[PDB]
Amino acid sequence: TGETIRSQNVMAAASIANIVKSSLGPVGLDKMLVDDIGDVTITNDGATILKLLEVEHPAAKVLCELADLQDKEVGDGTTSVVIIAAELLKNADELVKQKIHPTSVISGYRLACKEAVRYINENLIVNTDELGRDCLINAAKTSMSSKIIGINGDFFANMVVDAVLAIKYTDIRGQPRYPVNSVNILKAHGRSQMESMLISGYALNCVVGSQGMPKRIVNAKIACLDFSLQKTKMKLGVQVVITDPEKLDQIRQRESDITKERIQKILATGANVILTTGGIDDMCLKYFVEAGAMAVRRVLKRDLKRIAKASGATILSTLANLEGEETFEAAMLGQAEEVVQERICDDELILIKNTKARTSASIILRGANDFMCDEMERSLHDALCVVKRVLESKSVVPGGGAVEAALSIYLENYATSMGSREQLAIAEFARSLLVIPNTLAVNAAQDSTDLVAKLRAFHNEAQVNPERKNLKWIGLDLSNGKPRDNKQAGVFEPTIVKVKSLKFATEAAITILRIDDLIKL
Amino acid sequence: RESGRKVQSGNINAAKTIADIIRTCLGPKSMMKMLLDPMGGIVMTNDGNAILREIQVQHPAAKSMIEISRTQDEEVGDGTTSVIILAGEMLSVAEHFLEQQMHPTVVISAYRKALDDMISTLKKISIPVDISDSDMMLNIINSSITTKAISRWSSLACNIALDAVKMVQFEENGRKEIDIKKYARVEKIPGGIIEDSCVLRGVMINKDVTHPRMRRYIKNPRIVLLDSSLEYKKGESQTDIEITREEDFTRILQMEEEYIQQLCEDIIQLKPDVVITEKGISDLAQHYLMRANITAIRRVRKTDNNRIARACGARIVSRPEELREDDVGTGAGLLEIKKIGDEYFTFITDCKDPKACTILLRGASKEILSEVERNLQDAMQVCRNVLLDPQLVPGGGASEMAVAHALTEKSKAMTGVEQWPYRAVAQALEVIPRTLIQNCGASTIRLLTSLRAKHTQENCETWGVNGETGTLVDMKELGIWEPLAVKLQTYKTAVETAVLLLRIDDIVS
């Protein structure tokens, strides 16, 4: 209790910080996690693993609330807020051991926290369009683990970033916003990976029809079907009459001609290209060609529900009205620019060009392996997280680790002209800032004390800017950490991620220094 | 709460002490592991899958050693003994020299470049095998049946296993990658004898149909696979209550057979004499077919009817109201139900979508069946890797010492920090060349020396160590061979384990 519980606060949180220092960044490591008597999970992104683990101390308990407070709001900086607060605990304790009030340090901790976010306010950039987020080619290049995907490391990253970044695509059921949602990019192999190309519109793997049905329709009305075909079942209800036993076979084939009426009523509201999730027989393709329609069968529901949200109005991929094959009543139609059949991967597939109600964009990736499909998944998860940070945070911050050394430079002058005890509190808050280049180089298996000493050595004055890398602070690397320009190999950061984690760290640190009791019945 | 080098060394001490007794279990000449139960029970095996499941492990890294053995078992089933041997000395030799210097990420990327250099060296050492010659396939199976040292009638089961797997080579992923063995089916027979049997076309069934419920014999008529809707109509076209009343008996039963006879007329269009029905099968539906002169079959699991659909190469219809010869029963087809023992065994030959032939074995007992089967079980592993990769790598230390040198000049070329894990993996490859010298009984320091000397001249192309004679032998002359694919995935699993436990520095609760 007293100092001992404030010791027990530090000693618990330091051990928790040791877990997530060994899990930070892509060079972080996976940790064995006992959660049951026979279940051990092995992961990183350490805010996720604290949810996996169970708490031991109330000191351990309060910080699992804090990282989840970061993690509910955003996915970035979630494991980082744990490390910063534990650095505050060792810095303030020596001062409390020296002479200092616990009240006095947390003031200059929060005052520097007000001062640091005002550095973030002056370290903003909104031009993140041609500069990109993390050096447009390097937005995927550090995330494309260069196995057979680094040989197109500037080829792929020029394509997959520009296709998502600020150009058109529709969100969920047609919401006005640039791409923040998952896209209709497909992964399939064949003949090369240098042939992976951008397409204007939608990628759909589908089973095309061939008995004289139209192969290319411009200005098409799209019917996205959720309901299958290849017969509608009926044994009585049409033709009750009996003259011969041949007429008994005439009864149960009247399930054919009742579908013939309902297809033209589907065509009457709006239809040019029929996309059916279920299969369509060639006898059931005959219902569409005598009305006049482009029926493509066995459509993948995953891409089609991306189209049914894009195509506009009330669509059959959202309808629950079913008659075996239901008929339209009023205003059930989806929209498109044009439907052009293409030769892609040397496979004749229906390449749906842009829907009306927010025209779109996607990529058909080509590979040589099923392993090419696997690696471009994580080369799709990376760019979508890059672009989502751009579209909601247009104003971003250049540098994420370059800022940490310069904030320490920004605060030592802010410490110096402050006056009293607060000066030493601003400086020890800056000592907590240095751990971010420190945990990365250990994770990157490099020297921490060398690399952070390189950072501060690049300086003219205390401002991170993309001017120059030899006489100003700019950027970092997730595998090197050397300060680099933010178009070649440096780093950006959204402004929203840092201002929460810096606020959350002092928010944890204030309540920990309140703790001077272990009273119990 | 565990951290630091102590987790790392505990990862070393656990993964090493597993591979110690199991490398003595390696080789066709081996050393059995003894397991004393606390009840006094004795286990005397070499197969690590029976070993790892039986032993009690307390370190979850040792539990992860079972998991990467479950990885190799579910993909192959063989080499699970060998994947844990290589992964020990990767983390035994390199780690403590370098984690006192503490660079985890560099040894990961060193483990990356140890993998692909082995891949190109596999293409250097492996000459292609003939997938169109039985005798090119024969000696590699003969290298596998002598591991258990059973060649009573496994030698004739060599040709039975290769004429199954080479025949069932059909598997697509967009570029036709074939690694299938589930399309093949063994015959489990108490009667008859092995030698006067042979492989038959299609996929032969022994799992549920053991009776002549189909016909006695079939020359012309087709097989019908029914997942279609055969549930009868209770009302006029309605689903009312079923027959439980005399008043429900007179009205409904006229429409019960009425749904069935429409389906039966659709099936007689292709003229079968056999119809098997699996989904939607009713008791009335399969006995109006008895009145429609077709003996009908149910109570069969779905994996049978994937084989039966591959026994004829046809698509199982989901359309009830129209069936064709191009839907079920592709081509003419053949169905043969004959007496082997006392039970009448259904064979379905004449598979259109050709090249489909499966295993017909028959022991004089089930025990006589089962002992030859395990050798043919290992034999169908090998030919599946022949279908996966048609190049054969020499066994023994010919493959290992050749790759162990190529890392060294790679270490001299790259000469960064990663040069030190290359020579460590280069010694980690040699443990199976090491353990064969105990599997024979010779001086291990001289034989490892001369195997380096044969790399100086012959490059160890086919001159590796034998744990049978204790000398460095021509693998061409002695016929010790295996495909490249089983060598790669064994090494690929050991790379995965070494990267895995290198990430493990903390084990917490």
Side-chain angles (χ1 to χ4, degrees):
Chain A
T1 186
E3 191 272 332
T4 306
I5 192 54
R6 287 177 295 171
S7 300
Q8 187 172 359
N9 291 317
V10 176
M11 273 73 166
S15 298
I16 303 306
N18 291 316
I19 303 304
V20 293
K21 283 183 288 184
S22 63
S23 294
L24 182 140
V27 292
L29 286 309
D30 288 332
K31 308 285 104 175
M32 286 185 181
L33 307 172
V34 176
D35 290 330
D36 292 330
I37 196 58
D39 294 330
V40 172
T41 59
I42 300 101
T43 49
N44 56 359
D45 193 4
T48 64
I49 79 183
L50 291 176
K51 295 173 70 175
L52 297 173
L53 291 173
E54 298 294 326
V55 300
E56 292 85 4
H57 295 286
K61 186 183 289 184
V62 64
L63 297 177
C64 185
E65 296 174 352
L66 190 73
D68 198 5
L69 181 63
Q70 187 64 255
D71 190 74
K72 290 183 179 71
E73 294 170 349
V74 72
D76 290 332
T78 61
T79 184
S80 297
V81 69
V82 180
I83 306 179
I84 300 167
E87 292 291 326
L88 293 171
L89 296 182
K90 295 180 182 179
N91 291 320
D93 197 3
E94 296 174 354
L95 305 179
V96 171
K97 288 189 290 295
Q98 185 180 2
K99 64 178 76 173
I100 306 291
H101 296 277
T103 68
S104 298
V105 279
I106 194 56
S107 61
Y109 287 156
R110 292 178 293 111
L111 289 174
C113 182
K114 182 178 73 175
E115 184 66 27
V117 299
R118 288 175 291 173
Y119 180 74
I120 298 172
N121 290 319
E122 68 184 2
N123 197 3
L124 288 176
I125 184 171
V126 68
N127 288 319
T128 176
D129 299 331
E130 185 63 31
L131 299 175
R133 197 179 77 92
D134 297 335
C135 307
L136 288 167
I137 55 179
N138 209 170
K141 184 65 178 67
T142 48
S143 296
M144 290 183 288
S145 300
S146 294
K147 302 178 180 71
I148 48 191
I149 60 188
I151 60 182
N152 296 116
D154 292 331
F155 177 74
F156 289 161
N158 198 5
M159 178 180 69
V160 302
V161 174
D162 291 331
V164 186
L165 184 59
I167 69 162
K168 62 184 181 67
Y169 179 72
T170 177
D171 284 332
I172 182 71
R173 297 294 297 167
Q175 182 177 3
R177 182 63 66 192
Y178 294 102
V180 295
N181 288 321
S182 296
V183 289
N184 199 358
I185 297 181
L186 296 179
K187 273 78 68 178
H189 61 88
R191 294 177 293 169
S192 290
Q193 65 271 16
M194 285 71 70
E195 296 175 353
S196 299
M197 289 179 183
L198 173 61
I199 55 108
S200 296
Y202 282 145
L204 178 65
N205 194 1
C206 60
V207 179
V208 301
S210 66
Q211 69 180 1
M213 73 98 208
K215 300 296 185 291
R216 187 260 184 187
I217 295 187
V218 64
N219 290 318
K221 272 78 72 177
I222 305 303
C224 301
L225 277 75
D226 200 8
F227 292 152
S228 66
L229 204 60
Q230 293 183 355
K231 194 165 283 190
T232 60
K233 273 75 67 179
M234 185 269 285
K235 298 301 189 292
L236 197 146
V238 182
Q239 193 173 0
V240 78
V241 297
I242 293 294
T243 303
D244 291 332
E246 185 179 1
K247 300 294 288 184
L248 184 63
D249 289 330
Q250 298 291 321
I251 297 185
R252 299 177 292 178
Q253 70 179 358
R254 295 297 95 193
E255 59 188 358
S256 65
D257 294 335
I258 60 174
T259 311
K260 292 184 177 181
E261 182 67 30
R262 295 177 293 172
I263 294 303
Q264 296 179 356
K265 294 182 184 293
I266 292 169
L267 187 66
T269 302
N272 294 119
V273 178
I274 301 300
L275 296 174
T276 302
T277 304
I280 299 178
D281 286 330
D282 293 330
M283 185 181 72
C284 291
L285 181 57
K286 188 174 87 274
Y287 298 119
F288 296 95
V289 299
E290 68 186 1
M294 180 173 177
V296 177
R297 66 264 187 97
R298 295 178 180 90
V299 177
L300 178 65
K301 182 67 176 176
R302 292 187 290 114
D303 299 335
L304 189 66
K305 70 176 185 288
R306 293 181 179 91
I307 296 165
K309 65 101 176 181
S311 66
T314 303
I315 203 63
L316 185 51
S317 290
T318 59
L319 287 172
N321 194 1
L322 179 60
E323 296 176 353
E325 181 67 29
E326 63 94 24
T327 177
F328 286 168
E329 294 179 353
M332 288 81 168
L333 77 164
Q335 296 302 110
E337 290 290 333
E338 65 182 1
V339 173
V340 182
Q341 184 176 2
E342 291 292 327
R343 183 70 172 173
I344 192 101
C345 298
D346 284 333
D347 287 328
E348 289 290 331
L349 294 176
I350 301 309
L351 271 71
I352 296 105
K353 274 74 180 173
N354 302 118
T355 60
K356 300 295 294 295
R358 288 298 295 264
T359 56
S360 65
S362 295
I363 297 182
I364 303 185
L365 291 172
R366 293 184 180 173
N369 292 315
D370 294 329
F371 181 75
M372 286 301 295
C373 296
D374 294 329
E375 293 292 325
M376 295 305 293
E377 290 174 352
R378 294 182 291 113
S379 180
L380 188 273
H381 291 292
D382 55 359
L384 187 60
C385 293
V386 166
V387 171
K388 184 175 173 66
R389 297 295 185 271
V390 175
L391 295 174
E392 297 295 326
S393 297
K394 301 294 194 294
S395 67
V396 294
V397 178
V403 294
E404 296 293 325
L407 278 165
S408 296
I409 304 308
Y410 183 75
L411 264 59
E412 286 172 351
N413 294 317
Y414 180 71
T416 305
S417 297
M418 179 55 67
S420 297
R421 294 172 184 262
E422 308 294 324
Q423 169 168 0
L424 187 56
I426 294 154
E428 294 294 327
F429 189 79
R431 300 282 75 76
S432 295
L433 297 173
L434 298 174
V435 71
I436 303 306
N438 287 319
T439 182
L440 182 61
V442 172
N443 286 317
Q446 297 180 359
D447 291 331
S448 291
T449 62
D450 289 332
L451 182 62
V452 68
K454 297 295 183 181
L455 292 168
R456 296 175 64 186
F458 291 111
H459 64 277
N460 191 2
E461 294 295 325
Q463 184 65 41
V464 177
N465 48 6
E467 290 181 353
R468 60 197 184 274
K469 66 184 289 293
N470 53 1
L471 196 61
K472 295 296 287 185
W473 285 279
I474 194 58
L476 199 76
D477 196 3
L478 293 175
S479 297
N480 294 117
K482 279 78 178 174
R484 290 176 180 89
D485 196 5
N486 288 340
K487 183 62 179 68
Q488 183 180 3
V491 69
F492 283 98
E493 185 68 30
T495 184
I496 59 172
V497 177
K498 298 294 185 181
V499 298
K500 294 189 288 290
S501 297
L502 291 174
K503 183 60 69 177
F504 291 161
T506 60
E507 182 180 0
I510 183 170
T511 62
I512 291 165
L513 273 67
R514 306 292 90 192
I515 307 172
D516 283 324
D517 58 342
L518 195 62
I519 60 163
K520 180 175 172 66
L521 184 63
Chain B
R1 293 183 180 180
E2 294 178 354
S3 293
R5 301 292 307 279
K6 276 76 65 179
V7 174
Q8 300 181 358
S9 65
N11 292 318
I12 293 173
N13 294 120
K16 184 177 180 180
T17 193
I18 295 168
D20 290 335
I21 186 56
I22 302 181
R23 68 175 62 96
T24 67
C25 295
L26 288 173
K29 295 194 176 180
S30 67
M31 294 181 184
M32 294 293 177
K33 180 173 182 178
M34 187 174 288
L35 286 171
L36 180 62
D37 300 337
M39 296 74 167
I42 306 109
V43 177
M44 297 299 289
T45 58
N46 286 321
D47 292 331
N49 299 116
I51 290 166
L52 289 175
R53 291 175 295 171
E54 182 65 30
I55 59 175
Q56 295 179 357
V57 289
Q58 295 300 108
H59 195 192
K63 297 178 176 65
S64 298
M65 295 299 289
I66 303 178
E67 294 294 325
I68 58 109
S69 294
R70 292 296 95 194
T71 303
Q72 186 67 40
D73 186 74
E74 292 174 354
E75 66 181 3
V76 179
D78 195 2
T80 65
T81 307
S82 299
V83 292
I84 59 187
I85 303 306
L86 298 173
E89 293 87 10
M90 294 177 183
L91 299 173
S92 300
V93 178
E95 181 170 359
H96 64 283
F97 291 111
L98 299 176
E99 295 295 323
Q100 67 189 356
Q101 298 175 355
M102 194 63 71
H103 50 86
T105 309
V106 181
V107 183
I108 292 162
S109 64
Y111 287 164
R112 296 297 302 160
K113 301 291 184 179
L115 181 65
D116 53 352
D117 186 74
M118 182 268 179
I119 297 175
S120 298
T121 314
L122 283 175
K123 298 296 183 182
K124 294 176 180 67
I125 193 176
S126 298
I127 193 70
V129 75
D130 291 331
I131 61 176
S132 66
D133 184 75
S134 296
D135 293 332
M136 294 301 107
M137 297 173 72
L138 186 65
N139 52 0
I140 307 174
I141 299 170
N142 294 320
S143 298
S144 296
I145 62 172
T146 188
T147 303
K148 293 180 175 66
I150 301 179
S151 296
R152 184 180 66 187
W153 295 108
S154 300
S155 296
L156 292 179
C158 298
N159 290 318
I160 302 300
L162 62 89
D163 289 329
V165 182
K166 176 177 71 176
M167 279 59 167
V168 298
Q169 185 185 2
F170 59 100
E171 187 178 0
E172 295 291 333
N173 55 356
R175 63 187 185 271
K176 193 181 176 181
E177 297 293 325
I178 308 106
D179 52 352
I180 192 55
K181 65 181 181 292
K182 188 176 68 66
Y183 292 175
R185 182 63 187 170
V186 296
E187 287 293 322
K188 295 180 182 180
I189 302 179
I193 202 55
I194 304 274
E195 304 90 12
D196 55 352
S197 293
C198 66
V199 294
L200 271 300
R201 293 181 65 190
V203 180
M204 291 183 282
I205 302 296
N206 54 354
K207 293 177 69 67
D208 287 333
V209 180
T210 310
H211 297 84
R213 191 174 174 83
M214 297 186 182
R215 282 301 181 186
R216 294 295 189 271
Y217 293 101
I218 284 298
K219 300 292 184 182
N220 212 169
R222 273 76 175 176
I223 185 66
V224 173
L225 277 300
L226 288 180
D227 289 333
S228 297
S229 177
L230 282 80
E231 178 68 28
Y232 57 89
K233 296 294 185 290
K234 274 79 72 176
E236 291 173 349
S237 180
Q238 295 177 356
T239 60
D240 294 331
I241 61 180
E242 295 178 354
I243 294 184
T244 186
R245 185 81 281 279
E246 301 175 1
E247 298 291 327
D248 293 332
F249 183 75
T250 61
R251 181 183 61 83
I252 298 174
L253 182 64
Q254 185 178 3
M255 288 72 168
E256 292 188 353
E257 296 176 353
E258 188 177 2
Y259 182 77
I260 305 310
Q261 64 183 357
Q262 183 60 43
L263 302 180
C264 293
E265 182 66 30
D266 295 331
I267 297 171
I268 293 168
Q269 182 180 2
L270 61 90
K271 186 61 178 65
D273 282 330
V274 175
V275 173
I276 187 169
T277 310
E278 298 89 5
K279 296 180 178 67
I281 181 55
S282 296
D283 293 333
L284 182 63
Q286 62 173 358
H287 290 93
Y288 181 73
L289 284 164
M290 292 298 291
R291 296 176 179 89
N293 299 115
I294 298 161
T295 63
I297 302 97
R298 64 177 295 275
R299 188 76 278 280
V300 286
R301 63 179 61 88
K302 278 79 176 175
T303 63
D304 289 333
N305 302 108
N306 296 118
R307 294 183 187 273
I308 294 169
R310 289 187 299 271
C312 59
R315 188 260 304 167
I316 302 178
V317 292
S318 298
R319 183 182 65 190
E321 295 294 326
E322 183 177 1
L323 280 77
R324 296 176 294 171
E325 294 178 354
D326 293 331
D327 289 333
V328 294
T330 57
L334 288 170
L335 189 144
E336 301 290 324
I337 303 179
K338 65 176 68 64
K339 186 173 182 179
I340 301 173
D342 201 7
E343 294 171 348
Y344 293 168
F345 289 155
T346 296
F347 291 169
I348 302 177
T349 60
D350 194 4
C351 182
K352 297 295 177 67
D353 188 3
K355 292 175 70 176
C357 295
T358 55
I359 299 107
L360 173 59
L361 290 174
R362 50 176 185 177
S365 178
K366 297 294 288 184
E367 183 68 30
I368 302 183
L369 188 277
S370 298
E371 294 174 354
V372 185
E373 182 180 2
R374 296 178 292 112
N375 300 111
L376 189 143
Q377 182 179 2
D378 295 331
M380 67 182 180
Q381 295 305 118
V382 173
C383 297
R384 185 182 57 83
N385 295 117
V386 175
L387 302 185
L388 186 60
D389 188 79
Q391 294 186 357
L392 70 164
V393 65
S399 177
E400 296 292 326
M401 189 60 70
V403 179
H405 282 83
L407 296 172
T408 61
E409 291 97 14
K410 185 175 177 66
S411 68
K412 294 185 288 291
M414 295 181 73
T415 185
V417 188
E418 293 182 354
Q419 59 178 353
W420 297 99
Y422 291 128
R423 295 177 181 88
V425 171
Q427 296 301 109
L429 293 174
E430 296 175 355
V431 64
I432 301 181
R434 282 194 289 270
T435 190
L436 286 175
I437 315 172
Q438 287 85 26
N439 282 316
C440 69
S443 296
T444 183
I445 57 179
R446 299 296 297 265
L447 269 299
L448 293 167
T449 291
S450 298
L451 189 58
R452 294 180 184 272
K454 287 187 181 292
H455 188 277
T456 306
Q457 298 173 356
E458 294 167 346
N459 301 114
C460 291
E461 294 174 355
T462 174
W463 292 274
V465 63
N466 204 169
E468 291 177 352
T469 182
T471 60
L472 307 173
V473 296
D474 190 5
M475 300 301 170
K476 297 181 179 181
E477 183 179 2
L478 276 75
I480 300 304
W481 290 93
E482 57 184 358
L484 184 151
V486 67
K487 175 64 73 176
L488 178 61
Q489 299 178 359
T490 300
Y491 179 74
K492 184 180 89 276
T493 306
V495 171
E496 182 180 1
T497 307
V499 175
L500 178 62
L501 299 176
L502 182 54
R503 299 178 65 89
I504 305 304
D505 298 336
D506 297 328
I507 300 171
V508 296
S509 297

